[PDB]
Amino acid sequence: MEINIGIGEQDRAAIAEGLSRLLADTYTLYLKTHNFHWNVTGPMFNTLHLMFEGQYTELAVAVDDIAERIRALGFPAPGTYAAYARLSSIKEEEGVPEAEEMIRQLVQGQEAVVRTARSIFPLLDKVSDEPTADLLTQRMQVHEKTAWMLRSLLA
Amino acid sequence: MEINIGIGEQDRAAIAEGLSRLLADTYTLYLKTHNFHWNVTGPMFNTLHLMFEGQYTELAVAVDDIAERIRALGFPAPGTYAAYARLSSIKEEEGVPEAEEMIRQLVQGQEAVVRTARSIFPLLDKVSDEPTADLLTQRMQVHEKTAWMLRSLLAS
Amino acid sequence: MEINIGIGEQDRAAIAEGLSRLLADTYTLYLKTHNFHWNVTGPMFNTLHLMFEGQYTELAVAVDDIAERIRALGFPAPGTYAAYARLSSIKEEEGVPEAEEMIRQLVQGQEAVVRTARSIFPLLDKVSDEPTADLLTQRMQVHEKTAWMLRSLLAS
Amino acid sequence: MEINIGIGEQDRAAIAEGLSRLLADTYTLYLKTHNFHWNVTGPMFNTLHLMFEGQYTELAVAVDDIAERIRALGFPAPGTYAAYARLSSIKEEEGVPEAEEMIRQLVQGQEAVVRTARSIFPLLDKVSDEPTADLLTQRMQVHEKTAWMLRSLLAS
Amino acid sequence: MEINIGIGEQDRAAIAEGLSRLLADTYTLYLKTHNFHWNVTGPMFNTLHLMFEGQYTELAVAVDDIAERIRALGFPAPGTYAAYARLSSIKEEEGVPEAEEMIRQLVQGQEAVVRTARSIFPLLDKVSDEPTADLLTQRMQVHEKTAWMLRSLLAS
Amino acid sequence: MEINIGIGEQDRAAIAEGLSRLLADTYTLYLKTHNFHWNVTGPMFNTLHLMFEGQYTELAVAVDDIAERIRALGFPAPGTYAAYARLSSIKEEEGVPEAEEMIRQLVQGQEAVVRTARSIFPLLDKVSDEPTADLLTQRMQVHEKTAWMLRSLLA
Amino acid sequence: EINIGIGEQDRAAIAEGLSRLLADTYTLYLKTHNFHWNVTGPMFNTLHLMFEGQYTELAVAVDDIAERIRALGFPAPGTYAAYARLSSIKEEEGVPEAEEMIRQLVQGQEAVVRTARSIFPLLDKVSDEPTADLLTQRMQVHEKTAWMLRSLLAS
Amino acid sequence: MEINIGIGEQDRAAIAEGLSRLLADTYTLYLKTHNFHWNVTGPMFNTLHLMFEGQYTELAVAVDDIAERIRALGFPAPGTYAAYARLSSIKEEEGVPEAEEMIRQLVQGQEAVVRTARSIFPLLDKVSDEPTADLLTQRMQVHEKTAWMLRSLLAS
Amino acid sequence: MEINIGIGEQDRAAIAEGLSRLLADTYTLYLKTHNFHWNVTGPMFNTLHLMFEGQYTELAVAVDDIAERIRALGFPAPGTYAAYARLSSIKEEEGVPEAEEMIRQLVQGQEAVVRTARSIFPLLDKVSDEPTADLLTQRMQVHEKTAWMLRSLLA
Amino acid sequence: MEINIGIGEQDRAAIAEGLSRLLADTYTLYLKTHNFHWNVTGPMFNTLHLMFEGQYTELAVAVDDIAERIRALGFPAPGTYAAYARLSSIKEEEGVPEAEEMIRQLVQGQEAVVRTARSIFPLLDKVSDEPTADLLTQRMQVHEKTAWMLRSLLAS
Amino acid sequence: MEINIGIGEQDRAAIAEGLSRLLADTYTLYLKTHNFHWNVTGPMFNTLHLMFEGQYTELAVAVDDIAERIRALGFPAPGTYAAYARLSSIKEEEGVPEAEEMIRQLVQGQEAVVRTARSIFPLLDKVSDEPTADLLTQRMQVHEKTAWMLRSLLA
Amino acid sequence: MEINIGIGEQDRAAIAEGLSRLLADTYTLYLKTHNFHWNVTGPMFNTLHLMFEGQYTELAVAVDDIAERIRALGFPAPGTYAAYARLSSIKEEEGVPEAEEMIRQLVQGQEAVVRTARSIFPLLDKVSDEPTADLLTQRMQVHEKTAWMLRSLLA
Ligand SMILES: [Cl-]
Ligand SMILES: [Cl-]
Ligand SMILES: [Cl-]
Ligand SMILES: [Cl-]
Ligand SMILES: [Cl-]
Ligand SMILES: [Cl-]
Ligand SMILES: [Cl-]
Ligand SMILES: [Cl-]
Ligand SMILES: [Cl-]
Ligand SMILES: [Cl-]
Ligand SMILES: [Cl-]
Ligand SMILES: [Cl-]
Ligand SMILES: [Cl-]
Ligand SMILES: [Cl-]
Ligand SMILES: [Cl-]
Ligand SMILES: [Cl-]
Ligand SMILES: [Cl-]
Ligand SMILES: [Cl-]
Ligand SMILES: [Cl-]
Ligand SMILES: [Cl-]
Ligand SMILES: [Cl-]
Ligand SMILES: [Cl-]
Ligand SMILES: [Cl-]
Ligand SMILES: [Cl-]
Ligand code: NA
Ligand code: NA
Ligand code: NA
Ligand code: NA
Ligand code: NA
Ligand code: NA
Ligand code: NA
Ligand code: NA
Ligand code: NA
Ligand code: NA
Ligand code: NA
Ligand code: NA
Questions:
Q1: What residues bind Fe(2+) 4, as annotated (chains B, C, D, E, H, J) (predicted)?
Q2: Which of B1, E53, G22, J122 is the most exposed place for a label (fewest CB within 10 A)?
Q3: How many domains does chain F contain in total?
Q4: Which domain holds residue K149?
């Protein structure tokens, strides 16, 4: 069936490509947060183990919300290691950092997702895509709140 | 008491007029979806009976949310067959279509509500009615998601 | 597939027609109650907004129970503005009455549905349809209880 | 202690005999539905696995309700394979039919329980056993609704 | 506001008189059960303290259902010691019986409520009061089930 | 088995007699509140129907708490119309008052239960029965709160 | 095709064993349900409740066993004729005294355990850890239930 | 650690200052509503005690949402009587007004918070802070809805 | 309608004045705890954010309980910034202390409320106001428990 | 930090010593009740297994409440077999008594805890420790209720 | 601190290596299942969208359970695209297959995880690591149940 | 009534003896963990007060499960201070250690329970007691996970 939602196909394609980067960054942050949840040690173990659990649980919902918007626009949602590695701007961490460096990297990760979200708003400038704008806004809100909670631990 | 929310009376009346159309389209889609929930048959009965139930349950809440926004603007919320027949832009189905045609009509219905919402946005941008703009945005999100799920069923 | 539930097709058709009137009245009362929920004002706002919400929430379940009995008898459940306007005996209200008149109209609405339910029992005279009789009975119970609560508000 | 509930002992015995047949048929349909839940295959697996689960869960409660009514009347509730094989009127399926034949058999099973309940009503009318009549009415309501949902799957 | 539910005033008064007897019986059995819950002793303490709690909790709801039906018919619901002592057919117990005698009295109490309910049906048939008949039927179901559970405790 | 809880039998009997009056008053107020819940009419119907429901639901628990304290002291809990009518100081209402008179009577009923509870403390002053004193105090707290809510409606 | 490391002949033999376990469990389920309805005497309330807990558990157990048969690629039996043929539970067509009901339910638990024990040799030279775990869980439940039941028969 | 969220420090500080105003107005409305909840009397006591409770419960959560956005921007959230008395535009009520005047003051309070929120959008437009704009919009929605419910109570 | 709860009007006014001070101290501590919840930083952020949330949630219930007792006694409950600043003995904190100083101040706050509660018991000496005494006792219990939890962090 | 709760250190130490005896008695009764829950047999198994579970579940909460009051007073809470064996006045039971003797011992245990609690009030007379007095009162209330339920099982 | 759980360090390292492969396969199947959930179309959309959601939700918990057993053994849990792509034996799908091919690939994926689990059991039997053996048993149970449900759709 | 669950009386007695040691160790760890929950202080108070609460709550359930398995085998479950002191291999702490020493003792306590469990498997293999072996395996899983979380705090 045709897709008749007030956005041309070329614009929908461009928006889906932007949201694909957002999905890749969100998913990459999801796994890094999960990773640090398992692997953190030291006197902050209990508090960070729990904090990182709350974060990755939220990000698992977020990846669905972003993927579903891509589908609503009429495009497949990427979902493989190869696709996400190509699309993601998150810095990979292959070892086990000290707890304070884990915190720092997760702050940087929140800010990287915000930066990707901000990069999509220009694609919406000439277009009427209020739902996508709202999704970007909700993601920025969560990541900016999470950045505050994380960087507070480093004070 | 006067209404002092940063939107003048003429503009609030115009927003209420638009939301009355959105309310009527949402209600018409609600009743059509409820109808199809009762009346669908064929091998997809269990999946569509359930899917249409989720949809009309969500739409019943949306009807309340739209009507309450009209009230917050200072105007009566329409709520009769006669009013909704005039205000709506969705054709009702008077018979019992095959399941695939029911699906197609509900795709078109989602898009008709999005189209009505789209007709109201320029007014909201002009007068800066941020809460109504957010309401319309949420409706567009829901309807565009539901259109994806429905049309997916028609793919080969 | 054949329907073999101890009621012949001609009787099932007649009972389904009667229940179609009950469905239309119940749905029309549902929307009127929803309408008054949004639109009531005055010192009784909070209590009537809440009371009417309880009522239309219940009526939304009731319309399913009625429509599903029609389907069990082997007939399509009506569900459009045109079909309900034709079948309904509820008096339409296109304006915004005072709170006390909203209450009076909803009492009349309860009693109108009861009258419609009572009108169906003769169709069951010569047939064995205990489930339909029970459905009518349950609706009469709910509407008679609601009528007491509503009219109590109009006493001194 | 004496049982003084307005029905004499011989009539209570007769009602308990009838309910024993209804219990056996309900239990036979319960086990058949549970069987088909485990064993159904094909593209309708997910939806029929779930649909049949809802049905056998409901029937498990019904068997308790029927057995407890026999106890209230002063008689033991039958509860063995031998008793249910004798008292039932539903043929069990010993193999694994295709999904559409499973559905067809469950339609016929609902109608079989209705037919057994129908066989008991003249006695209940004669001795005015209101609680048992209401129990049979609820069972007919459930089975007739379930028959609609099942046979709908066999339509085009 | 008038009551127009298909039953004339003198007939509604007659139904309310019957239900006032049923309410008084039910409330008196409620307090007796509550009393025995507090006061039972012996090796059956835990089981009877719990069983009686379940019963009086249910009866507290039932007294509401009965009182509300009286109100729906247009009459005040009795609710004093003097009114219930006058209307009730339950035997008063001013002491603390042995556990087995408490059980026996509670069996008789269930049957007293059933007997009152059974006396009301002919009037309901005459004037076609279907909701009240269903109320009576549901109470008979609960009380006849409870009588079975209670008297079972007295067997060998 | 003997009762050895630090209170002699004659004192326990006297305390149980006082609590029997409290139980009778509480139960009589319970039924009056239930009665007015069914029978109230007028423009306050919805609010008073609900308010009175909350009150009699609470009173149903209270009668259990009082009866169980009587049992813990080693005495039977009264539980019949004749016993409560004999013991109760609540004024009986055989008709259907107007809503404002229902409210007034329920205020008086709360205050009557408080008066009965207060009448028991002198007995405890001699004996040291801390759990009974606490029960009386809880009942006074509830009834004094409820009296405020009720009389506010009449302001 | 089914490639879970077992091979169809062993899957068939294990499924036959689990078919006996299913029949015994289902037959005990119905017998427990029967005794729940039909028990009388001073133990009525406690046995009515105890037997309800047991048959509620067994209703879940029959699903767990049937699903394992399906995972092994065989149909789950489910008729009176099939269960009469497969089951080793002693049938009871009357209404025993409460103490004899308890005794028969003890014997029923032990019969299910005996059937479960008979299946473990079918898992020699097979890698079927999930079936072994299922048998183990059923033995745990029935051995616990047997203790609770036989405790009622002690002096 | 640096804050790199696409908004420079000077603009974050200015937005946080605006949100500090909103927090103070929300908290002052919270305390006023809580106060009126305790102190309201008259025949509307039950309805207003409950309505004001729902409002202050909601506002207790709202102050968290606003305070947390201030923290996300990198600034401390004000939280003392001195700070809120200074920052707020809402005149507190030091006495116990009649119920109608409590309602009127709470309507005015909703509109004062809305006015404060509307005062912040100009800053956000120039700098692009979408999350803060969404927070403002959500608060405006709640307060405009609440203003409708409150002022409805004052109608004739 | 008159208030007849066994306490004369002059005594009720005196008790209500005492409770007004308790309300003001409890509310001031409520807002200080809420403040520190938002504003705390450092490695204890997660645990103190949560701990302070539990505390202010409890104090919000407590201010209702205290205010409602004032209303039950027949007097208006105070509820403005000016009324509470006038009545409160809590030391105000206009800045953002280090986490350890936040903890110390919250210990002091618990002890200040206890002090205010203790100051009211003499009024209840000549007068029998058992519900108010119980309310004071419950507040002291809660605040003394909270003080232990807080000061343990500084050990 | 200093402890400034209006009780001097020497008095807090004496109160903590009394509460340590209460904690030891409560914990010893907790384990004895848990023991009897596992080990009871006979026709009362189901009712006593359950009753003792309710009791030990409550006692597990109480040991926390008592221990936390010791900590609030500024002293360590004892928590070892040696510490409790030294402090406890409960009679130890190393075997498996008959069910009636288990009940009797648990009655004696409730009364022993009450005796210990009562022994502490003299300390609180000279001092002002209202929270500790309330804790003692709540424990006495629970143990006196439980003693009634237990000894009722031993009545004729 | 020493790890003294009855398994020597070299053996724990070898078990962790095997569990790292199992984690990688489970995570790859998790993402593939999540992918197919978003991207499936055709008349089976509703049923497969829901079924695949149930599966990936379960796998998300399983990933946690496997990773935390690795931690309990004293080794870091791998958690990056590069690590999983190196360790995983699952075939990734970079396109959008038809619904029946998605089902077939998910059947293969269940059987692939079972193969990996089966390859680890000999080490666990040699070492007597009973908790890890139970974990692998539960994974085999779930994947074998899931394989039945999936392949039933293709009959 | 006889016990016929496929294990002879002397072998059941031997299993019950092993489980009696396991029960005693689990109960001793339960009380030590409960003690440390009450008594821990210092900057880790919030995280350890909570962590130790979760642990003792879980252990309270574990003692029931172990005790009930002894009963299912036909033997009394030990349940006194004297029995547990005799049977237990955990040394109790009579004082109030620093938080880090509390953590270390609780790690050693987890490993002590595991050590007792491991000693019992040869008997269970010999007589084929599968339910007891699963119980031991579940306890080892919990204790090995808990040891990891505890010792991580010391890194
Ligand atoms: Cl995101
Ligand atoms: Cl990054
Ligand atoms: Cl919409
Ligand atoms: Cl359309
Ligand atoms: Cl009408
Ligand atoms: Cl209706
Ligand atoms: Cl049936
Ligand atoms: Cl059939
Ligand atoms: Cl009744
Ligand atoms: Cl009687
Ligand atoms: Cl009271
Ligand atoms: Cl009075
Ligand atoms: Cl089994
Ligand atoms: Cl057997
Ligand atoms: Cl204002
Ligand atoms: Cl706000
Ligand atoms: Cl306080
Ligand atoms: Cl301070
Ligand atoms: Cl205690
Ligand atoms: Cl003792
Ligand atoms: Cl896995
Ligand atoms: Cl694969
Ligand atoms: Cl353990
Ligand atoms: Cl150790
Ligand atoms: Na999804
Ligand atoms: Na609404
Ligand atoms: Na429906
Ligand atoms: Na039952
Ligand atoms: Na009621
Ligand atoms: Na009770
Ligand atoms: Na199943
Ligand atoms: Na917060
Ligand atoms: Na309040
Ligand atoms: Na604790
Ligand atoms: Na985890
Ligand atoms: Na237990």
A1: 134, 138
A2: J122
A3: 1
A4: 1-155
